[PDB]
């Protein structure tokens, strides 16, 4: 449909003008998916308004994905889906991040993001500032190296096995 592509286009322009201290570009994937960019420092302020009405009542994170790419000056590339209800439609803001720079946590803005901060922390190196409690999930205890680092072998570097002489795995 052309129509949706129109409305998303114009709306992308709309937000592009409303708050352009940080919207690097508002590309519309041709199959009707808008997606603006964000300077990594700018995460909270954008998303904040993204809940706040103008039309951007995009409540509820659908997810907090963390695409990786070995190239680029900063490899990890965070992504935020969002959904507005009354105007039933979805957008997708996203940023970028150094292996070492601590981007802030976005838990307060989208509310249901507490679990995700922990996820991406234990599936990646990236740290979220002002997060109440990053800690491991989806792993063993020690384990150490983050998976999903695009490098890092799927077979990992370790294995458990039970050993009778010490009577322990």
């Amino acid at each position: 449909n052309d129509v949706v592509h129109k409305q998303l286009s114009a709306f992308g322009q709309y937000v592009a003008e409303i708050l352009p201290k940080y919207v690097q570009q508002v590309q519309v994937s041709c199959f009707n998916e808008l997606e603006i960019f964000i300077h990594p420092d700018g995460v909270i302020p954008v998303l904040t308004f993204l809940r706040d009405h103008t039309n951007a009542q995009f409540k509820s994170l659908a997810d907090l994905t963390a695409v990786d790419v070995p190239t680029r000056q900063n490899r990890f590339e965070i992504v935020y889906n969002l959904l507005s209800l009354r105007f039933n439609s979805r957008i997708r803001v996203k940023t970028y991040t150094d292996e070492l720079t601590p981007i802030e946590s976005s838990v307060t803005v989208y509310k249901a993001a507490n679990w995700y901060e922990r996820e991406i922390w234990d599936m990646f190196g990236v740290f979220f500032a002002n997060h109440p409690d990053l800690r491991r999930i989806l792993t063993d205890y020690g384990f150490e190296g983050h998976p999903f680092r695009k490098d890092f072998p799927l077979s990992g570097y370790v294995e458990l096995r039970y050993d009778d002489e010490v009577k322990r795995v």
Partner: protein
């Protein structure tokens, strides 16, 4: 809505809404287009507020189910504006 709490005679509270709106955003330099649009719709909706003392068709006028929620939407816009200039 389960969290939604019934609020009789919205209209007064509404007038406090849009007035607190225009006032708290009243500090916006004409620069950013935010003041432009947000005032644009705000004054339109508020114009309907004065225009529509009745509620039963009023929410057929704001084009939003249960105006009782959208007053809290505007409530969100109030803290929104509270953030707008902290963001400068």
């Amino acid at each position: 809505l389960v969290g939604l709490a019934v609020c009789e005679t919205p209209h007064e509270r509404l007038k406090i809404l849009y007035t607190k709106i225009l006032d708290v955003l009243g500090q916006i330099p004409k620069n950013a287009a935010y003041r432009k649009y947000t005032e644009q719709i705000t004054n339109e909706k508020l114009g309907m507020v004065k225009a529509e003392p009745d509620v039963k068709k009023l929410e057929e006028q704001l084009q939003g189910g249960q105006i009782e929620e959208v007053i809290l939407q505007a409530e969100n816009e109030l803290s929104l504006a509270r953030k707008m200039l902290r963001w400068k």
